[PDB]
Amino acid sequence: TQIPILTMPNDDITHPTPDLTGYITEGQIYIDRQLQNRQIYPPINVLPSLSRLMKSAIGEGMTRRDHSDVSNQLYANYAIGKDVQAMKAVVGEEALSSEDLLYLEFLDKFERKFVAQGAYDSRNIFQSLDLAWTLLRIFPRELLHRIPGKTLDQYYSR
């Protein structure tokens, strides 16, 4: 397995080397400058982050079955949370409904717990899935649209 740490000049991928290595390789995990500025030790940019072969890695025998489902659900919910943060900025946060506040607090808890990890703290992938699930319990069962049926009740019960 090859994991090059390629510095992107001028803080962009438009530079010849980042573009070339992106063309050659099959993934792109990102380090967001804002997260480091906001002082989150893992500055991983989850929204720009992507792996082409994510489906192959996740399975029943290796990893848990709900792994891909919670991955997609967290990604979509984080995008929604960013959108709702923008909405709260523009409207004054009074016009927001209950679900908007749910997405806001979900984003806040995500950045507080999941994104930030101890430099020496180690989490097994099972533990990481448990943490993501604990983040997920705050949403209602119906709200997790991306999560397949009979898998939501499998874990959302807690």
Partner: protein, 207 residues
């Protein structure tokens, strides 16, 4: 003024661990230190952990809070430029107040005056602690928001009712370091105690 992608600049930032990137806009703004607090960075932070702990354990968290406040101000500056300050909430209001307080009192050092010529670490840490403490107290006050009042009303109240503390936070810069460290520490401790008294009586009055 030139692009920071210049080959000399790119080569330097590859090996150098601390970049004190000055800002042309700050220089035109006559902000004498002119150090940009966004592009600049010091990779040596992890090493100085023991030093900061032995000096003042609380300094790390207050520094992180100040960085977060600055980042939030810089982020929402675009929003307020576009949308306008009307939608700004009480938390946004206190955030902007603290950001302006930093930009004026803290990051600005004239250095042409005896009080600003040299700033010892003990005075710098106390000023940052005072600013962060005021920010925390304002956050708690606007968060309480009870008794048919509070939140933005509490923010305006503490702006007017507690205006003296806010004004003398700026004068805390003018405190002369030459007077001696024990005296300055005592004065700053008294200011911190008064700030704690603030937002506590304001807590007692319940707006």
């Amino acid at each position: 003024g030139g692009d920071f992608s210049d080959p000399v600049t790119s080569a330097t930032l590859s090996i150098v661990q601390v970049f004190w990137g000055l800002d042309k806009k700050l220089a035109q703004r006559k902000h004498f230190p002119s150090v940009n607090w966004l592009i600049s960075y010091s990779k040596y932070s992890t090493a100085l952990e023991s030093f900061y702990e032995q000096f003042d354990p609380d300094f790390i968290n207050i520094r992180t809070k100040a960085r977060e406040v600055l980042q939030r101000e810089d982020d929402l500056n675009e929003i307020v430029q576009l949308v306008g300050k009307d939608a700004l909430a009480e938390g946004d209001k206190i955030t902007l107040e603290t950001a302006k307080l930093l930009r004026e009192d803290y990051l600005a050092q004239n250095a042409f005056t005896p009080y600003d010529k040299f700033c010892p670490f003990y005075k710098s840490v106390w000023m940052m602690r005072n600013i962060i403490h005021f920010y925390n107290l304002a956050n708690q006050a606007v968060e309480k928001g009870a008794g048919m009042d509070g939140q933005k009303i509490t923010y305006t109240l503490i702006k007017h009712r507690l205006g003296d503390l806010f004004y003398r936070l700026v004068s805390q810069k003018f405190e002369d370091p030459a007077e001696g460290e024990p005296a300055l520490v005592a004065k700053f401790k008294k200011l911190h105690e008064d700030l704690t008294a603030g937002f506590r009586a304001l807590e007692d009055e319940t707006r």
